[PDB]
Scaffold this motif. Structure first.
Motif, PDB file in Angstrom:
ATOM      1  N   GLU A 173       0.836  -1.184   0.000  1.00 50.31           N
ATOM      2  CA  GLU A 173       0.000   0.000   0.000  1.00 50.31           C
ATOM      3  C   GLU A 173       0.869   1.231   0.000  1.00 50.31           C
ATOM      4  O   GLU A 173       0.631   2.172  -0.744  1.00 50.31           O
ATOM      5  CB  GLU A 173      -0.945  -0.001   1.204  1.00 50.31           C
ATOM      6  N   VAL A 174       1.902   1.198   0.830  1.00 50.20           N
ATOM      7  CA  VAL A 174       2.732   2.370   1.047  1.00 50.20           C
ATOM      8  C   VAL A 174       3.846   2.444   0.017  1.00 50.20           C
ATOM      9  O   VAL A 174       4.640   1.513  -0.117  1.00 50.20           O
ATOM     10  CB  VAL A 174       3.339   2.371   2.461  1.00 50.20           C
ATOM     11  N   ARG A 175       3.891   3.550  -0.717  1.00 48.84           N
ATOM     12  CA  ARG A 175       4.968   3.774  -1.668  1.00 48.84           C
ATOM     13  C   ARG A 175       6.306   3.823  -0.952  1.00 48.84           C
ATOM     14  O   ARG A 175       7.320   3.358  -1.470  1.00 48.84           O
ATOM     15  CB  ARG A 175       4.756   5.066  -2.462  1.00 48.84           C
ATOM     16  N   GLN A 176       6.292   4.381   0.253  1.00 48.80           N
ATOM     17  CA  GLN A 176       7.502   4.545   1.045  1.00 48.80           C
ATOM     18  C   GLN A 176       7.950   3.246   1.709  1.00 48.80           C
ATOM     19  O   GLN A 176       9.054   3.182   2.244  1.00 48.80           O
ATOM     20  CB  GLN A 176       7.299   5.623   2.113  1.00 48.80           C
ATOM     21  N   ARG A 177       7.079   2.239   1.742  1.00 50.16           N
ATOM     22  CA  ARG A 177       7.470   0.919   2.247  1.00 50.16           C
ATOM     23  C   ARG A 177       7.767  -0.136   1.168  1.00 50.16           C
ATOM     24  O   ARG A 177       8.195  -1.245   1.489  1.00 50.16           O
ATOM     25  CB  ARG A 177       6.391   0.385   3.191  1.00 50.16           C
ATOM     26  N   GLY A 178       7.554   0.204  -0.100  1.00 49.44           N
ATOM     27  CA  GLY A 178       7.724  -0.762  -1.176  1.00 49.44           C
ATOM     28  C   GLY A 178       6.784  -1.958  -1.098  1.00 49.44           C
ATOM     29  O   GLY A 178       5.755  -1.911  -0.422  1.00 49.44           O
TER      30      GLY A 178
END
Ligand code: CLR
Ligand code: CLR
Ligand SMILES: OC[C@H]1O[C@H](O[C@H]2[C@H](O)[C@@H](O)[C@H](O)O[C@@H]2CO)[C@H](O)[C@@H](O)[C@@H]1O
Ligand code: 42J
Ligand code: CL
Ligand code: NA
Ligand code: NA
Lengths: 219, 534, 214
Positions: free
Chosen positions: A100-105
């Motif tokens: 979901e998170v772009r910042q979590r890949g």
């Protein structure tokens, strides 16, 4: 816990169409954006498409854009990728990747399903026993082999004695030569083990409906 | 498709900081602390800020940036049934601009009256004075301080007015100041956020310069710590009270200002993938931090009065215009180099209002620009018309009964009326539009969805903590009075219309567009519950 | 698109040494949007490092990320045989999302000579009309090895299928299968077949032959 299972995939005539599905379980599926990342036979990872949590935000790589359609069933927790006018460069392993998170890949990946796009007809493998040469003078350990030749498409399941002996076994990856794969597997055992005990090469090629056991004899 | 964006990102932040930071960060918050128990008041304040205020502050900013439209058009494209909210929200902002700008005019008047060796509000021997004038603040209403009489009997000439029925003559010095205000507002909002975003560099930042100078001058004065003590002293007994949580709430909501469509308008010019979650947090903090800082600024000086000037603290601790136009200038006059402290103070007040007024106006202009194409290209001509309407009608605020008109709008223009707008803003997003659909929208922008904390706040807490404070303000309602003057029963009804005319747009435009669209039965609602894309 | 290039393509390291691989982007990538994945042989990729310094769940402390802008790096403080895999970086800053070309980390070990085994064409293939001679070179290091086929002492080049296993997990060695393919005619037309493997471990090539008379 979280499980992603890719299904579908196989041989498809170029220009043909095929639909991949991903079974999501162990998390709220509607809560996470999903993407398809494919890996070519050259092991290059290419992001194909991304679908948002509600299916209202869709992105495509310029490669698959307009040919591929990624959809989502949040009711049954299934992710889909609909392919059309398939090309030989679309041949790859398609991964179902959640994040979901772009910042979590991408925090979870599936087992992947394999797409092969080729005009090459499905053909059954010829499985041959590899028996060592006559009067080999040795010894401490003897090496046996199994040649699976002239098949398409992959995979093949090669075990030994129905998978009983996995040790000292090298099963070499297939190599495509003029629309035909050729695989081989070597297994080394002590000369006391052979041929005083049966060593059989179990080859399964589900595509051509081939399940073949070949025992190796020193004839 | 493409709309203009902020010439720079700082322009946006300063616009939002500027709009959020206003005179109430000065003349309201520090009073509330002193009244509600000091640093103990920070707990309901912080809570209401955390659960109620910031989520709705965050929500507005997110919506603006995502839907890329003004207040009206945004809610039309969000929940077509509830598009009335966009009208309510803008019309509220329309009313506040009538009311709020005259405060800036007062600040400019005091500013122009501050060029002199000796400040006019120091003594009691001037023509505008009464025999009852005393040098500083007191108890008996009959005897005003020298600053109170200067403000009321000279600047306002409120003495010459018997109420809101008699406005009397127009003050042409005040009309001049009001004009100067609307001149500054025009050329800031003239070409749009091109100039606007650059102008707020001054108006938003300048008060922090003056705050610091007054913070140092304030804390360098005898009895300053006493004021800080009155300001922050932790009496927790007020937390148990109902009206304290009401005060902590309404302040938090009015201070951050969601529901005016300002945050919507200002954010609609943001780039889509910009991180608005860090912007909302950064702005929320700075706004509340400024209120905290100004608290020391006011009360350090307020303590100096109760020490050297021999006055009682409850008299000089005041909210509203009374604090900055009477109480605080009264103190400045006593301390050395007064003329300097006065000039920067009133300029601070003006620059506290302007950027706040910029937002209100922009909220209207952007909302109307996005609705009607006959606005956007014509913007230069439109804002001229709008501020001309503001000025002409605003001349009523420049009358001798001007404050009575001001004070009336002060209560009824916005008010709990903004709370029901914001309440409908929260319910529409979290329930009709839906949180899952809204979180997904923010994910596409900033890259990640809001935590479950924000979602519960938007869905449950904020509507709850809105609905019940707007209810407890209705039970604690009483007819409008300023000082000894009691507004007539008809003046109250006029204010309700002002408060009503906005809010009723929400059911009215709903009913109107509910009868307008083709269909029947249930699925008539689908047409109006399906967003712009769907 | 934003192309991420990784170097080295292949990297060999003895257990315990520090390794550093680099990831370079054509366009600047936000430090928050860059991630790293580890993919073991025959397995799915796994999220390894996210937001450039942050280890994922289960990932040992020996791994660390760093960098910003167009230059990022993954560093294993002390490498274990467990860590042999291919590492891909990635950027989520913008679309299309792109993965780095990847770094293959393989374990360095002591040199081992290949065990060469030559297998004459089976009687089952010979009746099918084809004949193929298979040579197995097993458990050797390093990976580079060179097979040469000789029929009757003259080198034959064309018609050879070479296959290499991925670096083995147990002994960290490599294996190769070379298959020289003829028909029943060209095979029966000759007698002596020679599989020779030139490898680092020996000055002389390891030779294994057979004759059709035997
Ligand atoms: C300046 C001083 C006097 C008062 C400032 C108080 C403000 C800035 C603090 C106090 C409590 C804080 C909140 C505590 C809880 C959360 C949950 C978190 O997931 C998001 C931030 C949020 C919502 C914080 C925002 C900032 C906050 C509201
Ligand atoms: C008066 C004393 C007590 C405090 C002074 C507050 C000042 C220093 C603070 C308050 C608001 C802050 C500004 C508001 C936010 C931004 C946007 C950012 O992109 C650059 C820094 C900048 C421009 C800040 C600079 C520092 C700032 C001006
Ligand atoms: O601040 C007091 C000084 O200015 C006053 O002048 C007024 C003037 O009367 C009014 O018409 C104008 O609009 O504002 C100025 C500034 O207050 C007094 O008249 C002066 O004597 C004082 O020095
Ligand atoms: N203090 C922020 C709330 C606010 C203040 C001034 C105006 Cl003009 C508006 Cl619309 C809204
Ligand atoms: Cl505040
Ligand atoms: Na404020
Ligand atoms: Na302002």
């Amino acid at each position: 816990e979280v499980q992603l299972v890719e299904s579908g995939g196989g041989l498809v005539k170029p220009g043909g169409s095929l639909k991949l599905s991903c079974a999501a379980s162990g998390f709220t599926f509607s809560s996470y954006a999903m993407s398809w990342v494919r890996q070519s036979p050259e092991k290059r990872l290419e992001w194909v498409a991304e679908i948002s949590s509600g299916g209202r935000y869709i992105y495509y790589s310029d490669t698959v854009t307009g040919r591929f359609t990624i959809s989502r069933d949040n009711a049954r927790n299934i992710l889909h990728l609909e392919m059309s006018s398939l090309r030989s460069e679309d041949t790859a392993m398609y991964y179902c990747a959640r994040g979901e998170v772009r910042q979590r890949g991408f925090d979870y990946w599936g087992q992947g399903t394999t797409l092969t796009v080729s005009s090459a007809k499905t053909t059954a493998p010829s499985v041959y026993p590899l028996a060592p040469v006559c009067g080999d003078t040795t010894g401490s350990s003897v090496t046996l082999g199994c040649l699976v030749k002239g098949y398409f498409p992959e995979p093949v399941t090669l075990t030994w004695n129905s998978g009983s002996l996995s040790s000292g076994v090298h099963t070499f990856p297939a190599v495509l030569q003029s629309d035909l794969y050729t695989l081989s597997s070597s297994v080394t055992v002590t000369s006391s083990t052979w041929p005083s005990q049966s060593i059989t090469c179990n080859v399964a090629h589900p595509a051509s409906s081939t399940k073949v056991d070949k025992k190796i004899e020193p004839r | 498709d493409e709309r203009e964006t902020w010439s720079g990102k700082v322009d946006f932040l300063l616009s939002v900081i500027g709009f959020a930071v206003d005179l109430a960060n000065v003349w309201r918050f520090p009073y509330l602390c002193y009244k509600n128990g000091g640093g103990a008041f920070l707990v309901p304040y912080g809570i209401m800020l955390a659960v109620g205020g910031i989520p709705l502050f965050y929500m507005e900013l997110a919506l603006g940036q995502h839907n890329r439209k003004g207040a009206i058009t945004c809610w039309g494209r969000l929940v077509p049934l509830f598009k009335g909210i966009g009208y309510a929200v803008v019309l509220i902002a329309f009313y506040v601009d009538f009311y709020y700008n005259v405060i800036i005019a007062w600040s400019l008047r005091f500013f122009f009256a501050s060029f002199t060796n000796s400040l006019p509000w120091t003594s009691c021997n001037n023509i505008w004075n009464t025999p009852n004038c005393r040098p500083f603040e007191g108890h008996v209403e009959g005897f005003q301080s020298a600053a109170s009489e200067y403000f009321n009997r000279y600047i306002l000439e409120l003495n010459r007015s018997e109420g809101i029925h008699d406005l009397g003559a127009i003050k042409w010095d005040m009309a001049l100041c009001l004009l100067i205000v609307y001149l500054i507002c025009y050329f800031s909002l003239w070409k749009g956020i091109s100039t606007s975003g650059k102008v707020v560099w001054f108006t938003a930042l300048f008060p922090y310069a003056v705050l610091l100078i007054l913070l140092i001058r304030g804390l360098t004065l005898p009895g300053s710590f006493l004021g800080i003590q009155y300001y922050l002293t932790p009496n927790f007994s007020a937390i148990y009270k109902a009206e304290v949580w009401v005060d902590a709430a309404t302040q938090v909501f009015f201070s951050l200002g969601p529901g005016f469509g300002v945050l919507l308008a200002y954010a609609s010019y943001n780039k889509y993938h910009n991180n608005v979650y860090k912007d909302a947090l950064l702005t929320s903090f700075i706004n509340s931090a400024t209120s905290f800082i100004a608290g020391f600024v006011i009360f350090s000086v307020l303590g100096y009065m109760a020490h050297t000037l021999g006055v009682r603290i409850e008299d000089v601790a005041t909210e509203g215009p009374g604090l900055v136009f009477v109480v605080y200038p009264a103190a400045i006059a006593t301390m050395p180099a007064s003329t300097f402290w006065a000039l920067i103070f009133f300029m601070m007040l003006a620059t506290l209002g302007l950027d706040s007024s910029f937002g209100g106006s922009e909220a209207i202009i952007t909302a109307l620009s996005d609705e009607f194409p006959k606005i956007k290209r014509n913007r230069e001509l439109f804002v001229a018309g709008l501020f001309s309407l503001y000025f002409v009608v605003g001349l009523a605020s420049c009358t001798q009964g001007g404050f009575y008109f001001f004070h009336l709008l002060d209560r009824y223009a916005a008010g709990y009326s903004i709370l029901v707008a914001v309440f409908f803003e929260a319910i529409a997003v979290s329930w009709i539009y839906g949180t899952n659909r809204f979180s997904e929208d923010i994910r596409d922008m900033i890259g990640f969805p809001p935590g479950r904390y924000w979602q519960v706040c938007w869905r449950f807490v904020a509507p709850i903590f809105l609905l019940f404070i707007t209810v407890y303000g209705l039970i604690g309602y009483e007819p409008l009075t300023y000082a000894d003057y009691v507004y007539p029963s008809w003046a109250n009804a006029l204010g309700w219309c002002i408060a009503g005319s906005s809010v009723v747009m929400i059911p009215a435009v709903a009913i109107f567009k509910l009868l307008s669209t083709p269909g029947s039965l249930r699925q008539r609602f689908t047409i109006l519950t399906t967003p712009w894309r769907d | 698109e934003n192309v991420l290039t990784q170097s080295p393509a292949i990297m060999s390291t003895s257990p315990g040494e520090k390794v550093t691989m680099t990831c370079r982007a054509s366009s600047s990538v936000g430090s928050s949007y860059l991630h790293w994945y580890q993919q073991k042989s025959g397995a799915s990729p796994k999220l390894w490092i996210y937001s450039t310094s942050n280890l994922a769940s289960g990932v040992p402390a020996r791994f660390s990320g760093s960098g910003s802008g167009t230059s990022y790096s993954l560093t294993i403080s002390s490498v274990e045989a467990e860590d042999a895999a291919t590492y891909y970086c990635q950027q989520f800053s913008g679309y299309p999302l792109t993965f780095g070309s990847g770094t293959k980390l393989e374990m360095k070990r002591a040199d081992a000579a290949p065990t060469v085994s030559i297998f004459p064409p089976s009687s089952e293939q010979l009746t099918s009309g084809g004949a193929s001679v298979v040579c197995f070179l097993n458990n050797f290091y390093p990976k580079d090895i060179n097979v040469k086929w000789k029929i009757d002492g003259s080198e034959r080049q064309n018609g050879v299928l070479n296959s290499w296993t991925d670096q083995d997990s147990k002994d960290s060695t490599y294996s190769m299968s070379s298959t020289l393919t003829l028909t029943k005619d060209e095979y029966e037309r000759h007698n002596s077949y020679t599989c020779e493997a030139t490898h680092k471990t020996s000055t002389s090539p390891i030779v294994k032959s057979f004759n059709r008379n035997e």
